[PDB]
Write an enzyme that holds these catalytic residues in place. Sequence first.
Site, PDB file in Angstrom:
ATOM      1  N   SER A  92       0.787  -1.217   0.000  1.00  0.00           N
ATOM      2  CA  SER A  92       0.000   0.000   0.000  1.00  0.00           C
ATOM      3  C   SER A  92       0.818   1.266   0.000  1.00  0.00           C
ATOM      4  CB  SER A  92      -0.897   0.031   1.229  1.00  0.00           C
ATOM      5  OG  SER A  92      -1.796  -1.047   1.185  1.00  0.00           O
ATOM      6  N   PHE A 269     -10.962   8.630  15.285  1.00  0.00           N
ATOM      7  CA  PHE A 269     -12.131   7.988  15.852  1.00  0.00           C
ATOM      8  C   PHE A 269     -11.847   6.709  16.556  1.00  0.00           C
ATOM      9  CE2 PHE A 269     -14.714  11.267  14.507  1.00  0.00           C
ATOM     10  CZ  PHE A 269     -14.311  11.658  13.234  1.00  0.00           C
ATOM     11  N   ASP A 285     -19.008   6.357  16.374  1.00  0.00           N
ATOM     12  CA  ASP A 285     -18.117   6.362  15.189  1.00  0.00           C
ATOM     13  C   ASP A 285     -18.855   6.605  13.896  1.00  0.00           C
ATOM     14  OD1 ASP A 285     -15.055   5.127  15.705  1.00  0.00           O
ATOM     15  OD2 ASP A 285     -16.519   4.829  17.278  1.00  0.00           O
ATOM     16  N   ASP A 316      -9.114  -4.288   2.392  1.00  0.00           N
ATOM     17  CA  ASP A 316      -7.841  -4.942   2.400  1.00  0.00           C
ATOM     18  C   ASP A 316      -7.722  -5.870   3.618  1.00  0.00           C
ATOM     19  OD1 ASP A 316      -4.560  -4.400   3.378  1.00  0.00           O
ATOM     20  OD2 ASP A 316      -4.951  -5.103   1.379  1.00  0.00           O
ATOM     21  N   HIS A 320      -7.112  -9.898   4.053  1.00  0.00           N
ATOM     22  CA  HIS A 320      -5.933 -10.478   4.776  1.00  0.00           C
ATOM     23  C   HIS A 320      -6.363 -11.542   5.778  1.00  0.00           C
ATOM     24  CE1 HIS A 320      -3.044  -8.207   2.856  1.00  0.00           C
ATOM     25  NE2 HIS A 320      -3.270  -7.066   3.441  1.00  0.00           N
ATOM     26  N   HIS A 432      -1.661  -9.885  -0.753  1.00  0.00           N
ATOM     27  CA  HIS A 432      -2.021  -9.115  -1.934  1.00  0.00           C
ATOM     28  C   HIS A 432      -1.837  -9.963  -3.188  1.00  0.00           C
ATOM     29  CE1 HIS A 432      -0.841  -5.161   0.380  1.00  0.00           C
ATOM     30  NE2 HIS A 432      -1.829  -5.809   0.965  1.00  0.00           N
TER      31      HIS A 432
HETATM   32  N1  LIG Z   1      -1.309  -4.213   3.711  1.00  0.00           N
HETATM   33  C1  LIG Z   1      -1.517  -5.264   4.620  1.00  0.00           C
HETATM   34  C2  LIG Z   1      -0.434  -6.414   4.612  1.00  0.00           C
HETATM   35  C3  LIG Z   1       0.942  -6.078   4.079  1.00  0.00           C
HETATM   36  C4  LIG Z   1       1.358  -4.823   3.726  1.00  0.00           C
HETATM   37  C5  LIG Z   1       2.660  -4.613   3.264  1.00  0.00           C
HETATM   38  C6  LIG Z   1       3.529  -5.655   3.146  1.00  0.00           C
HETATM   39  C7  LIG Z   1       3.121  -6.906   3.477  1.00  0.00           C
HETATM   40  C8  LIG Z   1       1.849  -7.114   3.949  1.00  0.00           C
HETATM   41  C9  LIG Z   1      -1.790  -4.777   6.050  1.00  0.00           C
HETATM   42  O1  LIG Z   1      -1.044  -3.962   6.616  1.00  0.00           O
HETATM   43  O2  LIG Z   1      -2.966  -4.748   6.460  1.00  0.00           O
HETATM   44 CA   LIG Z   2     -14.537   5.305  18.159  1.00  0.00          CA
HETATM   45 MG   LIG Z   3      -4.740   1.466   2.861  1.00  0.00          MG
HETATM   46 ZN   LIG Z   4      -3.320  -2.009   0.108  1.00  0.00          ZN
HETATM   47 ZN   LIG Z   5      -2.895  -5.187   2.544  1.00  0.00          ZN
END
Ligand SMILES: N[C@@H](Cc1ccccc1)C(=O)O
Ligand SMILES: [Ca+2]
Ligand SMILES: [Mg+2]
Ligand SMILES: [Zn+2]
Ligand SMILES: [Zn+2]
EC number: 3.1.3.1
Lengths: 481, 481
Positions: A92, A269, A285, A316, A320, A432
């Site tokens: 990200s 928040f 919230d 995201d 995960h 990802h």
């Molecule tokens: N973006 C995901 C997982 C992730 C990000 C960057 C590197 C590896 C994994 C998280 O933080 O929620």
């Molecule tokens: Ca809150």
């Molecule tokens: Mg993000």
């Molecule tokens: Zn992302």
């Molecule tokens: Zn992610």
Amino acid sequence: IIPVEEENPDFWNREAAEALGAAKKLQPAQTAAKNLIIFLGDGMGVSTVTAARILKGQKKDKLGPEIPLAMDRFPYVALSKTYNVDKHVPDSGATATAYLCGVKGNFQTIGLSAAARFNQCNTTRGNEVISVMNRAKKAGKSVGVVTTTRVQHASPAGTYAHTVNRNWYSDADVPASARQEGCQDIATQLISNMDIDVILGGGRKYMFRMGTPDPEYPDDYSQGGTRLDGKNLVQEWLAKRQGARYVWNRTELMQASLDPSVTHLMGLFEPGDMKYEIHRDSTLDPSLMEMTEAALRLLSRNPRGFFLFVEGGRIDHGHHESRAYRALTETIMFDDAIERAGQLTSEEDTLSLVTADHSHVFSFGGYPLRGSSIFGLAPGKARDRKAYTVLLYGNGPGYVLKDGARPDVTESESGSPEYRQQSAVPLDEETHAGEDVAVFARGPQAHLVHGVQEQTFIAHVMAFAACLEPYTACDLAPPAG
Amino acid sequence: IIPVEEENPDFWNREAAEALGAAKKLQPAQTAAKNLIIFLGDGMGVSTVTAARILKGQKKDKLGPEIPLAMDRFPYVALSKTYNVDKHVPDSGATATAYLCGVKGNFQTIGLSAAARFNQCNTTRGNEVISVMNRAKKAGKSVGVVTTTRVQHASPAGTYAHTVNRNWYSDADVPASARQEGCQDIATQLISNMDIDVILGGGRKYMFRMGTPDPEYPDDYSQGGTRLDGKNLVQEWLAKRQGARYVWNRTELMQASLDPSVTHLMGLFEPGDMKYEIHRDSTLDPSLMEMTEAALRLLSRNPRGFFLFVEGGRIDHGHHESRAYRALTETIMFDDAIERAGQLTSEEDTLSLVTADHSHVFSFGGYPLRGSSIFGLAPGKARDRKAYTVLLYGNGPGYVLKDGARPDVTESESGSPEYRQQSAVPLDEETHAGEDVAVFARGPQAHLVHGVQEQTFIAHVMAFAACLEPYTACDLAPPAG
Ligand SMILES: N[C@@H](Cc1ccccc1)C(=O)O
Ligand SMILES: [Ca+2]
Ligand SMILES: [Mg+2]
Ligand SMILES: [Zn+2]
Ligand SMILES: [Zn+2]
Ligand SMILES: *[C@@H]1O[C@H](CO)[C@@H](O)[C@H](O)[C@H]1NC(C)=O
Ligand SMILES: *[C@@H]1O[C@H](CO)[C@@H](O)[C@H](O)[C@H]1NC(C)=O
Ligand SMILES: *[C@@H]1O[C@H](CO)[C@@H](O)[C@H](O)[C@H]1NC(C)=O
Ligand SMILES: *[C@@H]1O[C@H](CO)[C@@H](O)[C@H](O)[C@H]1NC(C)=O
Ligand SMILES: N[C@@H](Cc1ccccc1)C(=O)O
Ligand SMILES: N[C@@H](Cc1ccccc1)C(=O)O
Ligand SMILES: N[C@@H](Cc1ccccc1)C(=O)O
Ligand SMILES: [Ca+2]
Ligand SMILES: [Mg+2]
Ligand SMILES: [Zn+2]
Ligand SMILES: [Zn+2]
């Protein structure tokens, strides 16, 4: 179920004739964008969009896949290549560099060219790449960051920060050598790098000194301030601006958003990320849609226009966890925020882009019947004679063996908001995915969003549309209006 | 590997500025398409495109994801919703109805509205929907079908056939009650429904009576004719047209394609589907690209223009096997055929669309380094302490347990053309996926291919562009040229 209307070819022929009509009516604007909005669905790849569309459709009266998402109504679509300079499957932070600053970066850095190196503070300087939000502010626009994550999280940080390590939320996270070398934690960068008129999301804890009780969870010490440097960044931010307000709950947010004397608003928040929508306390919230409206109330006052970043940040997170229910409900709320922003702004003067930073190894398969729940079982047993879901992940924490075997799954189980879809490969977190993501665009110069483009194009088209650096010689007439 | 050129923001800024320039130069045509080409990547979803791009890139000098596929250069992109009327995750027959006839159908039917029902011959009549290829022929254009599958397979059959059961390749497959009811097998429909100037692909066996040795495999009785009705459909087809030629191998195909007296050409190169490109005997069998060129040589003679269907038909087959190596190599050859057709035709008068009928539960994840092989291992072990691949499937026949456990995998293993990527759920065949697929378009009226559209739009835009029924009142000037 077969909808009877769809058995007649005329249904399809009429729809297509209407689509051709609409297609023919599209005309490019000769005029600039006054306002810019980027809606970022974190992890919202093509499979997520379709699955969310079906879920949203069914949440209304409908069978699912025939009902447009708000994003589906945007006229211009392109595919966006998400690779980071150093990794085919990106994170990200470095994607944010691409779609917010217009330059590709290395995995887990933010707002830096790929000359920088992850976690090496001494590679930072000279590699800072300035976001279009920053350029919008320079040009006199009001600017806003809205997300369901920590406002210091990788995506929103892309609008304002430059760091070799996206994990440096507060000074507590920054190794002493980096602190000495002047690599500021993201929370500091948030208040210090640039003026941001509206900042809405999570991440209270990074703004306050260790020992500071969280206002919402004063009895959970784990939620308290993290800072080692004794600073109250919220107070510092407020002190810099007359008309600045800090809020930590929904009712204060709504109050501030309607207050004409409030020129700068920081709404944080939760201590960290905001709760999933399905878990949100609606007294305390604001939803993403509500945060976006609050933002637009303030940002819209500026006659020069605004740049607004709105992130469906926990799409995201759901993937995960291999909890598609969470990914897809976050996606719907994200789409609801897109819809709401479209009600509050005009496509005559607002360029709106919807995209994702990257996708996930999320798949929608089996051969389910029309109208069946996206969280249900695929028809037919697998070769191990047990059921399987239409939604699966390539990898992630839904991989299970009970007594040497893939578990069977029932519909009641698969439909649970806590259910983890199975995967091929057990990982604590699903990964990802590297495939192209969609870019949806509407408004002035949205017609430039076309074909298959590098993800950096998102930032550049937005700068160009609003005649921001490096496109001040855009050849455009003033915004309509 | 980090390419040094990409560490400089200017690289990205220059590329984006060039992209903006190109975007700005796009102008819609006021003129009709003389020629229409649809390139159909069977099973070629977004994840397949990106993965194939990376593989193709690396097969050249390159790191991968930065190198455009030929399809990536097409200016207009839309997302296409692939659901069948009765199933969210569709098959090839009913999608073919959508993108070739412009009407959605029920799973495993072809060229029929969704009033028809799979495997119920008595629901056929009145539900036939005519393909744009058929309409092109009616308007005097030459028409061609080219595929690496059986020419009687679901996708090519969509251009000419109407059947409630895509499995009815020859009369041997059609139940007696259906034969009595006059539901013709697809091989019969191929020679009988309409005049087709060029037919190239597999499917010899369905054209000949049981007992007829295959010319290529006269010692494998399983490859011989299948027909029960004693007909030689090839002879019947030839007998109907002066200048007709039948070929079953590459050298005869090339010879026929250069022969000015050959006005109709039927080239059937295997008993069933053609071999995967990696298995193709290049003395005996033409590649997809070669079949497309042969087709274009003949089709291009007609001053009224042509409609051509070109299918990368065994992309799909590779994914069903959970052999990404096969899926992706078929995709590259498909793209090579797109490139080749673009060399042999003009975008001033040729509307070319590239799309997929549907996708697959194919994912590209882990966090592989830039330039690493798409068939390699994801960095890092899984939670069961064994390696895993960047390419995975949600379900399919790559699911394995050796002695109660997920097998470890090595790079040499994962890189094999026979390697089956692991999945979450064992199935004899991996499943299609239901997410939106891309549509890429260039040529006259290609700018109408935009946004998120029903898959039926593919057929309608093509009819409209060439002023075919139902759009004879298209409002277009004659084709440029
Ligand atoms: N973006 C995901 C997982 C992730 C990000 C960057 C590197 C590896 C994994 C998280 O933080 O929620
Ligand atoms: Ca809150
Ligand atoms: Mg993000
Ligand atoms: Zn992302
Ligand atoms: Zn992610
Ligand atoms: C960054 O610091 C590390 C650790 O001391 C050192 O190895 C490296 O040379 C430094 N790089 C730069 C650009 O100074
Ligand atoms: C919202 O915050 C203000 C403090 O800013 C507080 O006075 C009010 O009680 C809060 N609301 C709730 C429900 O906690
Ligand atoms: C098709 O035939 C089946 C089997 O005899 C019968 O049940 C059904 O009524 C028929 N449908 C039509 C449309 O005639
Ligand atoms: C190609 O086919 C023709 C028969 O049509 C035959 O004469 C020739 O031998 C064939 N070529 C090969 C290599 O079999
Ligand atoms: N439902 C309201 C709640 C709200 C508004 C503004 C700020 C805070 C909360 C919204 O869409 O606007
Ligand atoms: N299209 C695939 C598999 C399939 C098609 C239709 C229905 C179900 C499965 C095959 O024939 O190669
Ligand atoms: N390489 C040739 C071979 C060939 C041509 C035409 C017909 C048959 C074979 C092709 O692209 O055209
Ligand atoms: Ca052969
Ligand atoms: Mg096919
Ligand atoms: Zn298919
Ligand atoms: Zn298939």
